[PDB]
Short mmCIF file of C-alpha atoms in Angstrom, two decimals:
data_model
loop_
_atom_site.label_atom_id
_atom_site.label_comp_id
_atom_site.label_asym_id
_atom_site.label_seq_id
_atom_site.Cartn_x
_atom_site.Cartn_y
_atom_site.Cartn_z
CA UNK Q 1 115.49 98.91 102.64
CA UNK Q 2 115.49 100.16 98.62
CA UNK Q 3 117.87 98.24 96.08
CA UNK Q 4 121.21 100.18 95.96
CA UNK Q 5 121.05 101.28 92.05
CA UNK Q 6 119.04 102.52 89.71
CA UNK Q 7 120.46 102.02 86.55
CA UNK Q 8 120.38 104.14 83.88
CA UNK Q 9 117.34 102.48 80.88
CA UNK B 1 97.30 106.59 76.48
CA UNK B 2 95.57 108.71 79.33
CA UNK B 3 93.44 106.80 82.20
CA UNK B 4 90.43 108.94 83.98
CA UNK B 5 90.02 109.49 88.16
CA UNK B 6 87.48 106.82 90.03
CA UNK B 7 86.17 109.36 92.17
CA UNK B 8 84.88 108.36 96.05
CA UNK B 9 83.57 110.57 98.61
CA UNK B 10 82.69 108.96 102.24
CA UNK B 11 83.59 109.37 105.73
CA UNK B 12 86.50 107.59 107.99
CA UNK B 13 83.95 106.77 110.46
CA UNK B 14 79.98 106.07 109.99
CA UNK B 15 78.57 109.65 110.04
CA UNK B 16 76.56 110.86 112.81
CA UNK B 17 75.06 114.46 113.63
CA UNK B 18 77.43 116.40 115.37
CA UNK B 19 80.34 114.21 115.91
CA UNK B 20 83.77 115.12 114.59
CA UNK B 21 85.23 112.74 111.90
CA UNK B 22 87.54 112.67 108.59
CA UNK B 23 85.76 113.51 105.09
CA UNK B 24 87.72 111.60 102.49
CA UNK B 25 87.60 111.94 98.88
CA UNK B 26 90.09 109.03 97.19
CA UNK B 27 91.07 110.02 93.59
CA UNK B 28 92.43 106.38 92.00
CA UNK B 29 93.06 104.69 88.86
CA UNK B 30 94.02 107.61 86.98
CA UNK B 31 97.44 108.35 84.57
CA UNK B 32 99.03 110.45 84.50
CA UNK B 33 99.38 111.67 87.99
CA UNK B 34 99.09 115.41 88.29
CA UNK B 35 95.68 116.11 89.29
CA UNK B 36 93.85 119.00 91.26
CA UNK B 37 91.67 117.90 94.15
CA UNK B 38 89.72 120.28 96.06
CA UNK B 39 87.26 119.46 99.43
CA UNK B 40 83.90 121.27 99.45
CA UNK B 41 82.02 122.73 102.10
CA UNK B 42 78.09 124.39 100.41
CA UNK B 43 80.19 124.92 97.43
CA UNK B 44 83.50 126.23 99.13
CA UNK B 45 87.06 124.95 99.07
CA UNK B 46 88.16 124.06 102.32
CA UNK B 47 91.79 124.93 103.43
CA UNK B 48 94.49 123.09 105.02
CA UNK B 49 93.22 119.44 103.75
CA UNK B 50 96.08 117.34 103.46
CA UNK B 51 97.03 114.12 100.92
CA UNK B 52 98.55 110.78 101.34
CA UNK B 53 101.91 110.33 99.29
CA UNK B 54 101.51 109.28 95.55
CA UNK B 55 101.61 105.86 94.96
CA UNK B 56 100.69 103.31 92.24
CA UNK B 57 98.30 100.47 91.56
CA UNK B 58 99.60 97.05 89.96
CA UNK B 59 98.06 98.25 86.43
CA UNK B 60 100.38 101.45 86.76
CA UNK B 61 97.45 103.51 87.49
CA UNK B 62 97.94 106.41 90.44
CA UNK B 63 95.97 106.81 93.88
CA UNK B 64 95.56 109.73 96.54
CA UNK B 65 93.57 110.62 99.47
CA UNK B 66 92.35 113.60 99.96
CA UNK B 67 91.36 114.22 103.32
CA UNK B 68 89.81 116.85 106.57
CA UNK B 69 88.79 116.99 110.22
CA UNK B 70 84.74 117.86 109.56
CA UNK B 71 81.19 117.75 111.97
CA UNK B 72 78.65 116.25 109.45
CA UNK B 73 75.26 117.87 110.22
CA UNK B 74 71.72 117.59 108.94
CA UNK B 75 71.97 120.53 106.34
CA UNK B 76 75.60 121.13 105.48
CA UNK B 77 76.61 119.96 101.80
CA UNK B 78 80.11 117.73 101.18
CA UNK B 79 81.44 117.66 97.49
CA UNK B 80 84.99 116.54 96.39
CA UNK B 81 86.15 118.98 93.22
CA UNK B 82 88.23 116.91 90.81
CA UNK B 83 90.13 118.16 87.36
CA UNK B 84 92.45 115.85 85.68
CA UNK B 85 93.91 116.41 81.82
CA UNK B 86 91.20 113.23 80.71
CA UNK B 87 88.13 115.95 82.02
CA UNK B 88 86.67 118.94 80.19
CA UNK B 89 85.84 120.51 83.46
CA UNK B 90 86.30 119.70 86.71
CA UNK B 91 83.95 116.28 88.15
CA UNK B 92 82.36 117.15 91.42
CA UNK B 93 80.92 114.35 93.91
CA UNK B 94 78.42 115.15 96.52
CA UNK B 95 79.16 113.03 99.83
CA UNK B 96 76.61 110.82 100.81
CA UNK B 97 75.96 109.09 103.94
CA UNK B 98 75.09 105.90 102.71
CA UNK B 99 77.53 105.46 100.12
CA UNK V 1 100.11 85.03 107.13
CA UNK V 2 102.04 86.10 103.88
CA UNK V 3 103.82 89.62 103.48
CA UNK V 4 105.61 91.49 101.15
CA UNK V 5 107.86 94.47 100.54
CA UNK V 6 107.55 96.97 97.86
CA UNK V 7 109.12 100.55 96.86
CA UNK V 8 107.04 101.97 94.15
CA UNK V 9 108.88 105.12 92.15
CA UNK V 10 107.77 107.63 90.01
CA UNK V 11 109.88 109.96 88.11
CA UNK V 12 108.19 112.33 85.91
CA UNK V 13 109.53 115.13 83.31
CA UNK V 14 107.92 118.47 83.05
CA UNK V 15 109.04 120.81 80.60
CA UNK V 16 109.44 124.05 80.45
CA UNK V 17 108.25 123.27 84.74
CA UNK V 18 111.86 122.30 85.76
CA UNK V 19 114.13 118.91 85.79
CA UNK V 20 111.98 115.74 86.27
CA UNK V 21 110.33 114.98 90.04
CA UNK V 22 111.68 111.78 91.47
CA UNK V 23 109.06 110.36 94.06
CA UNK V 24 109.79 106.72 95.96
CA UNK V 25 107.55 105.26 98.90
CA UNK V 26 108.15 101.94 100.62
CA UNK V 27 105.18 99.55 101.86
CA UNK V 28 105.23 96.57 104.21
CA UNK V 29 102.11 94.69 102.87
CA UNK V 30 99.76 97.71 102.81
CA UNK V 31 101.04 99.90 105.32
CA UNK V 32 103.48 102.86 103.83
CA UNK V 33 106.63 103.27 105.96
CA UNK V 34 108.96 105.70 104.16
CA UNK V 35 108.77 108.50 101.57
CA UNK V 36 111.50 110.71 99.39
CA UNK V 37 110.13 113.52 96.86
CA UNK V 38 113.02 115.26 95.39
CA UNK V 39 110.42 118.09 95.06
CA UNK V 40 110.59 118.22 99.11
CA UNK V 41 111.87 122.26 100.41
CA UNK V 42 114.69 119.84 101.91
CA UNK V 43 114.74 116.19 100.20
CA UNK V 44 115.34 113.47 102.77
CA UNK V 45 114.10 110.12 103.18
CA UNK V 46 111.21 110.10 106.06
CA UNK V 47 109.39 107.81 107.86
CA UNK V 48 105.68 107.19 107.63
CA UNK V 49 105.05 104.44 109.97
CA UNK V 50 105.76 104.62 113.36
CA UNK V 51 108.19 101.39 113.87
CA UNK V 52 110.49 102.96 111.44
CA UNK V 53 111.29 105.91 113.44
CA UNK V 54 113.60 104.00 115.74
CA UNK V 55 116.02 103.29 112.55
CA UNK V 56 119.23 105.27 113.18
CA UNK V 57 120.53 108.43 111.05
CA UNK V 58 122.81 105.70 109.11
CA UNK V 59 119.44 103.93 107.82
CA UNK V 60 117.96 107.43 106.98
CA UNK V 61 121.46 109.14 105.50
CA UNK V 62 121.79 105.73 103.19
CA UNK V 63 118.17 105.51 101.75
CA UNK V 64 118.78 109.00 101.23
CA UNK V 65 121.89 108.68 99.06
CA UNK V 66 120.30 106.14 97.25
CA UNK V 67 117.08 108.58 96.23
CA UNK V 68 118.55 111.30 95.66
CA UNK V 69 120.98 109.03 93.10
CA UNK V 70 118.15 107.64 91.63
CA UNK V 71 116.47 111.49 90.93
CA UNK V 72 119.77 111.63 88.85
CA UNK V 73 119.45 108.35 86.96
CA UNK V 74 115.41 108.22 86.42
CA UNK V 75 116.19 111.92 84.63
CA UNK V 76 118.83 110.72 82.35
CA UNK V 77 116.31 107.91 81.07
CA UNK V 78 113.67 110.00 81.25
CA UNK V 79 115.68 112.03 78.36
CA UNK V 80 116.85 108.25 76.82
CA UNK V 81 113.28 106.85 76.50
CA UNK V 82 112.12 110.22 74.97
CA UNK V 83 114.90 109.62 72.35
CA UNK V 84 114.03 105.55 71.92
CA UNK V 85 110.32 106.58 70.90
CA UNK V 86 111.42 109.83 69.05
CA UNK V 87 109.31 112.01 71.26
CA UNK V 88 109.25 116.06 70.93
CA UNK V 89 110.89 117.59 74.10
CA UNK V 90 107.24 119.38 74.48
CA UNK V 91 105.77 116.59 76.25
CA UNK V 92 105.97 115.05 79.88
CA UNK V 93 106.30 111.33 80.33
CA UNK V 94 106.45 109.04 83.17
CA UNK V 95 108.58 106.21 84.01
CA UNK V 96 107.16 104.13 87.05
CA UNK V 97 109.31 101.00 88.67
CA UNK V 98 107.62 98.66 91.17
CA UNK V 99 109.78 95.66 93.00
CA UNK V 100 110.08 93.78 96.21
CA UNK V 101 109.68 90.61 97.62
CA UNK V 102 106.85 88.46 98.66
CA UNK V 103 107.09 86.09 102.03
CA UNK V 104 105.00 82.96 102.56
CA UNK V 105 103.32 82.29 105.70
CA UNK V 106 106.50 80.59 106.88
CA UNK V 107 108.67 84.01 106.19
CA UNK V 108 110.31 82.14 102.71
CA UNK V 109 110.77 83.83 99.96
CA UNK V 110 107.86 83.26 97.79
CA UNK V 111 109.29 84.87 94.89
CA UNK V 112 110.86 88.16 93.56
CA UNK V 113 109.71 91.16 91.62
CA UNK V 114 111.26 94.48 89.30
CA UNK V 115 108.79 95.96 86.72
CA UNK V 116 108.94 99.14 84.83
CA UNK V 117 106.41 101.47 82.95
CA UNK V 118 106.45 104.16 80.37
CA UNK V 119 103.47 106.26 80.36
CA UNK V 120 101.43 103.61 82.41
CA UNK V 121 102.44 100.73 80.07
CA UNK V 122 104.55 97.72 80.92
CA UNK V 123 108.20 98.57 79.64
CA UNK V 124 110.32 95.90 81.20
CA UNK V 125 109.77 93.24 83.39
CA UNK V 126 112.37 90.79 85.38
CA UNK V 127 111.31 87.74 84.43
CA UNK V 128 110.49 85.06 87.86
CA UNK V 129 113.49 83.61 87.16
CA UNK V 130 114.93 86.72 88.62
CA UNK V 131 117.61 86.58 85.77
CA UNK V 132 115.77 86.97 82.31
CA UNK V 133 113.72 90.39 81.48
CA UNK V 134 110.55 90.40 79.04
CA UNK V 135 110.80 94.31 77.09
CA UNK V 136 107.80 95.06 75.49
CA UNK V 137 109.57 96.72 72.56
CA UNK V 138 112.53 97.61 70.79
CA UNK V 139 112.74 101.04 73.01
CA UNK V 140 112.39 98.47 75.97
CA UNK V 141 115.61 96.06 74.26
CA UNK V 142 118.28 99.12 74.67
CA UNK V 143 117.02 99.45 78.32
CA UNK V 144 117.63 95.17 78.61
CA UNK V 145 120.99 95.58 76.47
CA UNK V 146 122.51 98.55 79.08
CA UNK V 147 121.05 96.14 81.90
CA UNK V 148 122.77 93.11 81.34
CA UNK V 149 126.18 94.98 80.39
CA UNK V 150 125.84 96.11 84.18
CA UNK V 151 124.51 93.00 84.85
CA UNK V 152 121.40 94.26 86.83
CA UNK V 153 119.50 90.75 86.84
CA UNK V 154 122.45 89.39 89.02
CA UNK V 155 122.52 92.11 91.23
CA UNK V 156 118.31 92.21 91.62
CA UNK V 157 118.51 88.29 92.43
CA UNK V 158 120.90 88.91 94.98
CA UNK V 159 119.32 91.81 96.60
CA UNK V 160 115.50 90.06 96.60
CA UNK V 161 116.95 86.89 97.96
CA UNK V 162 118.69 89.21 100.54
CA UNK V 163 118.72 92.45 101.78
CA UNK V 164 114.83 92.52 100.81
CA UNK V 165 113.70 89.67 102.61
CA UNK V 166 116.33 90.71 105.75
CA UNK V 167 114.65 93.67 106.17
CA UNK V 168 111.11 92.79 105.34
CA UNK V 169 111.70 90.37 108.20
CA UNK V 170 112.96 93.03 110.29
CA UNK V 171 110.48 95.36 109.87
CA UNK V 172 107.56 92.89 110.25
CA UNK V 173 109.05 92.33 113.57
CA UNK V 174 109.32 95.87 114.54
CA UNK V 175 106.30 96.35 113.36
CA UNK V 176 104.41 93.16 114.91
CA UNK V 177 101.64 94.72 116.64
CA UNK V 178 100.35 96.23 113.36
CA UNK V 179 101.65 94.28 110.40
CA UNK V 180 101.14 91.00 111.76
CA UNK V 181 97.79 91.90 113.16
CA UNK V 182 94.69 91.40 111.06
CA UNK V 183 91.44 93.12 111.59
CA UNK V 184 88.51 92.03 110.75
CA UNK V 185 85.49 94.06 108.90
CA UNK V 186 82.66 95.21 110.37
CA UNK V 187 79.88 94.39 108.47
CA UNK V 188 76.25 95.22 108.03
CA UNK V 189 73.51 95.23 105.58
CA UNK V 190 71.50 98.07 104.70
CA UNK V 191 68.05 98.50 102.57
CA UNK V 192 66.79 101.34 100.70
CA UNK V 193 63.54 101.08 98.19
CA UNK V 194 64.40 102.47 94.54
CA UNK V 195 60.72 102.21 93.61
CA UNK V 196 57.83 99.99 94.74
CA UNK V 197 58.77 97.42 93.01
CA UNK V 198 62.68 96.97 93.84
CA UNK V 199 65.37 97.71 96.59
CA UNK V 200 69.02 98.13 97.12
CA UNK V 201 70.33 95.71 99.13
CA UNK V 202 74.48 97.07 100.37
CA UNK V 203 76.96 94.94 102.35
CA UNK V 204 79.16 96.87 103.89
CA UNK V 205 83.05 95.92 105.11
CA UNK V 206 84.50 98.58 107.55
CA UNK V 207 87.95 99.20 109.54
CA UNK V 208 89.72 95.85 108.20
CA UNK V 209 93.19 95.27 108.27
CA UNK V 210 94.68 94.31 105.13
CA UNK V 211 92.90 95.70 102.15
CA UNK V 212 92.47 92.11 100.78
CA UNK V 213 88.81 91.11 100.89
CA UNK V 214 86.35 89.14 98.99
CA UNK V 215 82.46 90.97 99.30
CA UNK V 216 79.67 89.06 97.22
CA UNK V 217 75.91 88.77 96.84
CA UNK V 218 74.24 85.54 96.14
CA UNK V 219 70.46 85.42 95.05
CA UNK V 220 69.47 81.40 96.47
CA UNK V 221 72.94 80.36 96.83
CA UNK V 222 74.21 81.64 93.23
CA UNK V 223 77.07 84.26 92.68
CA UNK V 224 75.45 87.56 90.92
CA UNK V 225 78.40 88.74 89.74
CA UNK V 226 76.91 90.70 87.12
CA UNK V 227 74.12 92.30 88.72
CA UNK V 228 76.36 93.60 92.04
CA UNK V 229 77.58 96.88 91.76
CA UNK V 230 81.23 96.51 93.97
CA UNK V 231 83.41 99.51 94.11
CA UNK V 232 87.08 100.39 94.65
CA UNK V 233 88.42 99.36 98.23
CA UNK V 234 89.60 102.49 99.75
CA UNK V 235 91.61 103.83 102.51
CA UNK V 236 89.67 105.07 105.72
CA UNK V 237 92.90 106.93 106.92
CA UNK V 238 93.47 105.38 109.87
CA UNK V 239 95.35 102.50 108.27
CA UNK V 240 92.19 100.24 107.31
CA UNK V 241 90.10 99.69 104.35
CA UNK V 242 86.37 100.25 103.43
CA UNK V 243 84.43 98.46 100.75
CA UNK V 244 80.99 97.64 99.84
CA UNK V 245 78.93 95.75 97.14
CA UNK V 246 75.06 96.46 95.70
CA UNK V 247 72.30 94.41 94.39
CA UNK V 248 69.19 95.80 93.46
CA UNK V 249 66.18 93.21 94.12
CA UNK V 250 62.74 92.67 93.34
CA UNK V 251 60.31 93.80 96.74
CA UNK V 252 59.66 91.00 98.53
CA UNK V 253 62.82 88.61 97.75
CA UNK V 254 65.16 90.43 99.79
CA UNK V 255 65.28 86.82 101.98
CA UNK V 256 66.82 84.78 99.26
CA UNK V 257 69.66 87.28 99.02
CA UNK V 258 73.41 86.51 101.13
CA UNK V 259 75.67 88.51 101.48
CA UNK V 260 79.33 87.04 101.67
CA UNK V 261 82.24 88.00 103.63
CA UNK V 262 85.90 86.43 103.03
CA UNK V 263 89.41 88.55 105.34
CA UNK V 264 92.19 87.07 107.21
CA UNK V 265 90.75 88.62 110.26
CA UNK V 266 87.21 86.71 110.50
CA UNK V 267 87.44 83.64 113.20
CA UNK V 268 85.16 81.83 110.40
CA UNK V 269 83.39 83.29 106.73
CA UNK V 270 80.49 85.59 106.88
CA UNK V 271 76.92 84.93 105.26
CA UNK V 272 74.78 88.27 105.93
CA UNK V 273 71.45 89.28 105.59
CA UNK V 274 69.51 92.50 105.44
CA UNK V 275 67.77 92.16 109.30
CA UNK V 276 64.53 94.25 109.37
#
């Protein structure tokens, strides 16, 4: 299962 | 800043005369990704070959196969037909047996 | 043995071509399960391994949220890297991300992982420590900055030590008969004269299960490193690997050359010669 977030850089 | 295609062309099974099998070309440690790949057959681009999905190496660098249901024979020639921004014109690879 | 889990994304601006493509796969060791390409005619998550399928539209609707939020983000600092390096908006770039979790051969966690790339060169890194980042710039110190105000490091720590190594579990169970199941190479050594006076000597490995492998020639017990010719393992397409490596000897000493043969698969090492 992928991490949740992808914050924006 | 720009990282040329290792280029290998072989078979999914040892070749033999006459016996269906998978002709592979694997494009791989090239950046950036886009990248045309074409399957030849005496020169001629074969249709309907498909591609695995992209994915990366741990230096960053790309990887794709390129690959079709073919009968190796005696006289029939296998090439894989590579362009990639890093190439003046397009690299082709003959398939070998042995290789 | 030891596994791991990785996703591996790739978001990549084209312009003047549309808005950026957004590509993530998932791997279990070296066996890809999942895919989303935001380029897709109808972008969904889907499954490329068969012991995924029997994950229920819940799994599939949330790894699909979470792609198709990340196409969103990885454009947005796609446009904020381009600005950090002062690039024209003529240009494509590409911003890779790699992370997951290794297992050791008693299913701990080993240890964690989150990298990113800019154009194919390390960007930022979480440190092992799974709490500290190492940029490799001052472009790549705004990206740490924004991270720690949402206090990413905290929430990748928790999520490696978690959720990743739940699932990784999970799926190596589902997925026994393959992922746990190493096989072996089949090997052979073939001889070809390059003149009168010299040979090539290859050892091949074929149809082993992972793509880990150590291949290598010795001339009377001593590593020739620099004289083998070793390329690239590659895929066969059927889920195992190929590989070989080449020595070209003088006529007549092809007896004093061994080849060497190191997988997870082999009951015991192999030492190979060329039988004629």
């Amino acid at each position: 299962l992928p991490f949740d977030k992808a914050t924006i850089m | 800043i720009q990282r040329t295609p290792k280029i290998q062309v072989y078979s999914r099974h040892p070749a033999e005369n006459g016996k269906s099998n998978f002709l592979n070309c694997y494009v791989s440690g090239f950046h950036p990704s886009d990248i045309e790949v074409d399957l030849l057959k005496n020169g001629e681009r074969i249709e309907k070959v498909e591609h695995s999905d992209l994915s990366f190496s741990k230096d960053w660098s790309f990887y794709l196969l390129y690959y079709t249901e073919f009968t190796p024979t005696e006289k029939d020639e296998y090439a894989c037909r590579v362009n990639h921004v890093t190439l003046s014109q397009p690299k082709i690879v003959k398939w070998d047996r042995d290789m | 043995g030891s596994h791991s889990m990785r996703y591996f994304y790739t978001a990549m601006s084209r312009p003047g071509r549309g808005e950026p493509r957004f590509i993530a796969v998932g791997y279990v060791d070296d066996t890809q399960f999942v895919r989303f390409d935001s380029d897709a005619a109808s972008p969904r998550t889907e499954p490329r391994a068969p012991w995924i399928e029997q994950e229920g539209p819940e799994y599939w609707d949330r790894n699909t949220q979470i792609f198709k939020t990340n196409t969103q983000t990885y454009r947005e600092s796609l446009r904020n890297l381009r600005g950090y390096y002062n690039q024209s908006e003529a240009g494509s770039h590409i911003i890779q991300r790699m992370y997951g979790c290794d297992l050791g051969p008693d299913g701990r966690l080993l240890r964690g992982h989150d990298q990113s790339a800019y154009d194919g060169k390390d960007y930022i890194a979480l440190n092992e420590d799974l709490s500290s980042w190492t940029a490799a710039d001052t472009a790549a110190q705004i990206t740490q900055r924004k991270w720690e105000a949402a206090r990413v490091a905290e929430q990748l720590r928790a999520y490696l030590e978690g959720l990743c190594v739940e699932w990784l579990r999970r799926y190596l169970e589902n997925g026994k008969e393959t992922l746990q199941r190493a096989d072996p190479p089949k090997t052979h050594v073939t001889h070809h004269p390059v003149s009168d006076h010299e040979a090539t000597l290859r050892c091949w490995a074929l149809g082993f299960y992972p793509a880990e492998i150590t291949l290598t020639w010795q001339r009377d017990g001593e590593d020739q490193t620099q004289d083998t010719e070793l390329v690239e393992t590659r895929p066969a397409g059927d889920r195992t690997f190929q590989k070989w490596a080449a020595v070209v000897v003088p006529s007549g000493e092809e007896q004093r050359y061994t080849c060497h043969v190191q997988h997870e698969g082999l009951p015991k090492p192999l030492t190979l010669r060329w039988e004629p």
